[PDB]
């Protein structure tokens, strides 16, 4: 009886005393406290081996597939999560300069790749890495879409295009070639700053992609279930002209920006008029 | 601290096919002398 009592007491000490950490106060423990957090917050469960809900925009991407090698790990420390494992960072920047030939110099971001917010406010670092990966994949996708311009409608807008450089000349006043970098290849002057060509232009270009996704993703619901497009099905009730039939769809991508930025600098010309008044 | 992580590539894995092109141009010479 004494031996059985000692064995049961040892078992109870091993079970209910070394596992009562999170029962008294929520402390650092990946067990039943971290995995469900990120699960409920970001994705769902799936089992290839232990891969559950990789962030690849597969919901509306339709560009290229990518899996996620996400797995918990152990390490001796204090307040350490699972730290699940492109892997880099990207930056979108456009510059309307005068002109440029087919040359190479201290152009795109140097070793100081994409100076960005330190993000000192407390947030899950693994989640920051995850959203950064999502961002860089979005940059990859938008660049892959934008690259499809050489085989596009080559009329009224001639333009040269190479890897990472899409330098274009809509008017002989402005410049182009939005670029990107990979801030992962780094273990440890006065040309970078230019005219106003900053965040509040590129955001439109970025949003245009997800908007084109959305527009060609709304339930059909025309009457019961012919399963078609709203405007396409609603065309029948009215003898629309061939113009409207063509206007059912439209172009997208560079073309839009090809006008937009131009429009911008056009206003700039009018701006001169203002000060020209004083002159 | 890194003895099990084998970074697979399989994109340029074609290199292994090129691997069987050096011993054919010139093979290694056996020594049997572990000096």
């Amino acid at each position: 009886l004494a031996g059985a009592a000692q064995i049961l007491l040892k078992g109870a000490e091993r079970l209910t005393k070394s596992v009562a950490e999170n029962q008294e106060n929520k402390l650092q423990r990946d067990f039943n406290s971290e995995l469900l957090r990120l699960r409920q917050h970001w994705k769902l469960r799936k089992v290839g081996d232990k891969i559950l809900g990789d962030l690849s925009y597969r919901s509306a991407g339709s560009l290229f597939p990518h899996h996620g090698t996400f797995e918990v790990i152990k390490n001796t420390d204090i307040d350490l999560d699972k730290k699940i494992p492109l892997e880099g960072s990207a930056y979108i920047k456009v510059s309307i300069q005068k002109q440029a030939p087919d040359i190479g110099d201290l152009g795109t971001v140097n070793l100081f790749k994409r100076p960005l917010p330190k993000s000192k406010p407390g947030s899950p670092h693994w989640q920051t890495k995850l959203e950064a990966a999502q961002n860089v994949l979005l940059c990859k996708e938008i660049f892959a879409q934008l690259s499809r311009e050489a085989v596009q409608i080559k009329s009224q807008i001639p333009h040269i295009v190479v890897k990472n450089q899409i330098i274009s000349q809509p008017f002989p006043s402005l410049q182009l070639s939005i670029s990107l970098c990979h801030s992962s290849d780094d273990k440890k002057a006065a040309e970078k700053p230019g005219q106003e060509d900053h965040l509040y232009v590129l955001e439109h270009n970025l949003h245009l992609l997800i908007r084109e996704f959305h527009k060609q993703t709304v339930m059909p619901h025309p009457a019961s279930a012919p399963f078609g497009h709203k405007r396409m099905r609603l065309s029948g009730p009215q003898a629309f002209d061939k113009n409207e039939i063509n206007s059912i769809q439209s172009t997208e991508g560079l073309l839009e920006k090809i006008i937009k930025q131009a429009k911008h600098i056009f206003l700039r010309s009018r701006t001169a008029a203002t000060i020209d008044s004083l002159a | 601290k890194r003895k099990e992580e084998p970074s697979s590539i399989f994109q340029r894995q074609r290199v292994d096919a090129l691997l069987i092109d050096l011993r054919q141009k010139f093979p290694p010479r056996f020594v049997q002398q572990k000096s």
Partner: peptide, 19 residues
């Protein structure tokens, strides 16, 4: 006397990327 054979299998780079 290190080896008396012809070896190419030891590399055996795995895939472990089943989708």
């Amino acid at each position: 006397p290190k080896k008396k054979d012809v070896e190419f299998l030891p590399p055996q780079l795995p895939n472990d990327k089943f989708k």
